[PDB]
Design an enzyme around this catalytic site. Structure first.
Site, short mmCIF file in Angstrom:
data_model
loop_
_atom_site.label_atom_id
_atom_site.label_comp_id
_atom_site.label_asym_id
_atom_site.label_seq_id
_atom_site.Cartn_x
_atom_site.Cartn_y
_atom_site.Cartn_z
N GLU A 101 -3.90 1.61 -3.11
CA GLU A 101 -4.06 3.03 -2.83
C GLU A 101 -3.09 3.85 -3.69
O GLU A 101 -2.33 4.68 -3.19
CB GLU A 101 -3.86 3.30 -1.34
CG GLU A 101 -4.80 4.36 -0.79
CD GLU A 101 -4.65 4.56 0.71
OE1 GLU A 101 -4.74 3.57 1.46
OE2 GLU A 101 -4.45 5.72 1.14
N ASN A 135 -7.46 -4.45 5.15
CA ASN A 135 -8.03 -3.54 6.15
C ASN A 135 -8.70 -4.25 7.33
O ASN A 135 -9.85 -3.97 7.68
CB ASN A 135 -9.00 -2.57 5.46
CG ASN A 135 -8.37 -1.24 5.14
OD1 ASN A 135 -7.68 -0.65 5.98
ND2 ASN A 135 -8.59 -0.75 3.92
N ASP A 145 -1.94 -6.11 5.93
CA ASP A 145 -1.52 -6.57 4.62
C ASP A 145 -1.11 -8.03 4.68
O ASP A 145 -0.30 -8.43 5.51
CB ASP A 145 -0.38 -5.70 4.09
CG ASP A 145 -0.74 -4.23 4.04
OD1 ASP A 145 -1.37 -3.81 3.05
OD2 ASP A 145 -0.41 -3.49 4.99
N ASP A 167 2.77 4.78 4.93
CA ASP A 167 2.41 4.41 6.29
C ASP A 167 2.22 2.90 6.38
O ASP A 167 2.02 2.35 7.47
CB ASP A 167 1.15 5.15 6.76
CG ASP A 167 0.01 5.05 5.78
OD1 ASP A 167 0.23 4.58 4.65
OD2 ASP A 167 -1.12 5.46 6.15
N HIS A 168 2.27 2.23 5.23
CA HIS A 168 2.37 0.78 5.17
C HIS A 168 3.77 0.38 4.72
O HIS A 168 4.42 1.13 4.00
CB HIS A 168 1.34 0.18 4.21
CG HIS A 168 -0.08 0.34 4.63
ND1 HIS A 168 -0.92 -0.73 4.86
CD2 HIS A 168 -0.83 1.45 4.85
CE1 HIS A 168 -2.11 -0.29 5.20
NE2 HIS A 168 -2.08 1.04 5.21
N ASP A 228 -4.04 -4.86 0.85
CA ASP A 228 -4.52 -4.26 2.09
C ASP A 228 -5.95 -4.72 2.34
O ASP A 228 -6.90 -4.20 1.74
CB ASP A 228 -4.45 -2.73 1.99
CG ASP A 228 -4.85 -2.03 3.28
OD1 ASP A 228 -5.36 -2.69 4.21
OD2 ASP A 228 -4.67 -0.80 3.35
N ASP A 246 0.11 4.48 -0.49
CA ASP A 246 -0.46 5.74 0.00
C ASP A 246 -0.10 6.90 -0.93
O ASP A 246 0.63 7.81 -0.54
CB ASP A 246 0.04 6.05 1.42
CG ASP A 246 -0.65 7.26 2.03
OD1 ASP A 246 -1.89 7.34 1.96
OD2 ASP A 246 0.07 8.13 2.57
N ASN A 294 0.86 -1.18 0.00
CA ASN A 294 0.00 0.00 0.00
C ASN A 294 0.90 1.23 0.00
O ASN A 294 1.57 1.51 0.99
CB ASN A 294 -0.94 0.00 1.21
CG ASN A 294 -1.88 1.20 1.23
OD1 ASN A 294 -1.47 2.33 0.94
ND2 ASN A 294 -3.14 0.96 1.57
N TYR A 338 -7.61 -3.86 -2.50
CA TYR A 338 -7.64 -2.79 -1.52
C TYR A 338 -9.04 -2.74 -0.92
O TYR A 338 -9.96 -2.15 -1.49
CB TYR A 338 -7.26 -1.45 -2.16
CG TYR A 338 -7.38 -0.26 -1.22
CD1 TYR A 338 -6.70 -0.24 -0.01
CD2 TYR A 338 -8.15 0.84 -1.56
CE1 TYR A 338 -6.80 0.84 0.85
CE2 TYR A 338 -8.25 1.93 -0.71
CZ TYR A 338 -7.58 1.93 0.49
OH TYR A 338 -7.68 3.01 1.34
#
Length: 281
Positions: free
Chosen positions: A59, A175, A246, A271-272, A173, A33, A31, A134
């Site tokens: 993302e 989530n 993930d 941030d991943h 991801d 971001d 991911n 995602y």
């Protein structure tokens, strides 16, 4: 916060199967971001070091028509496929970049309700099907939890269909931190997105219905403090206050081919952090 640093050292790359066969396929999922933000943070330089056979990105926040030019400077991943929201805006979005061309590439999960936000790419190869996803966040205040539950069901039924024909590798991801061991603060997050009972159950249902196995947790059933996400806020990454969102989920028939499932904790750019799968196909 009540948390201090909790150490995690991802063990060495096990590049041979339990039968002694060397890994033939290396898949990396990340991911990013924001594709352009990621690139500016030298994410591509790390991809080069990892040298995966297949790269899956989530993302991307980038339309299929507006890719940054630097992805062309990616040597052995010339076959690149992208899915973004139907509204053609810059959010969500996934990508799949491969050394060889898949037999077929599809987008979405065959359900118009869930295919408008560019969340899924299906890449069919000779001996397996690769899906990168995602998964929709449950949202702040869980305002999207009811939709997420609808997504979970549809996605689960779709993957069961794919797996009925070929072995399946799901990555991306998803989530949700499945169990308490999959995040640093289970107690204070039971009512937050990513660790609601609803979402955790959806993950269990996913493993059961398809069926699929959590590759990392299969190899490391008791290893704590292994996370793939940390909030940018609150110095969380340095303290290792994170979530394992993930995954690489495998068909049971692929477990004999499972060499290792990695968490590249120190790779920056988002941030991943990236995750990497070694398979001996």
């Amino acid at each position: 916060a009540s948390e201090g640093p909790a150490l995690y050292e991802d063990p060495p790359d096990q590049k041979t199967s339990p039968s002694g066969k060397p890994a033939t396929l290396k898949i990396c999922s990340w991911n990013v971001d924001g594709l352009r933000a990621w690139i500016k943070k030298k994410g591509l330089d790390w991809v080069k070091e990892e040298a995966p056979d297949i790269l899956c990105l989530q993302e991307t926040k980038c339309s299929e028509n507006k890719l940054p030019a630097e992805l062309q400077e990616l040597p052995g991943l010339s076959h690149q496929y992208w899915s973004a929201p139907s509204d053609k805006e810059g959010y969500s979005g996934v990508g799949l970049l491969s050394r060889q061309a898949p037999l077929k590439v599809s987008y979405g999960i065959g359900d118009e309700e869930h295919d408008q936000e560019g969340r899924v790419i299906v890449a069919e190869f000779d001996s397996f099907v690769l899906v990168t996803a995602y998964v929709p966040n449950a949202g702040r205040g869980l305002v999207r939890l009811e939709y997420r539950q609808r997504w979970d069901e549809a996605f689960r039924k779709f993957l069961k269909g794919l797996a009925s024909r070929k072995p399946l590798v799901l990555c991306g991801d998803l989530n949700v931190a499945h169990e308490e061991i999959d995040l640093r603060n289970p107690k204070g997050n039971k009512k937050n997105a990513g660790f609601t009972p609803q979402e955790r159950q959806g993950f269990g249902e996913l493993l059961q219905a398809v069926p699929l196995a959590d590759s990392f947790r299969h190899l490391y059933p008791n290893t704590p403090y292994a996370y793939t996400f940390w909030t940018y806020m609150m110095n969380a990454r340095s303290k290792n206050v994170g979530w394992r969102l993930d995954y690489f989920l495998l068909s049971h028939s692929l477990l004999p081919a499972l060499c290792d499932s990695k968490i590249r904790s120190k790779a920056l750019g988002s941030d991943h952090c990236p995750i990497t799968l070694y398979l001996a196909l």
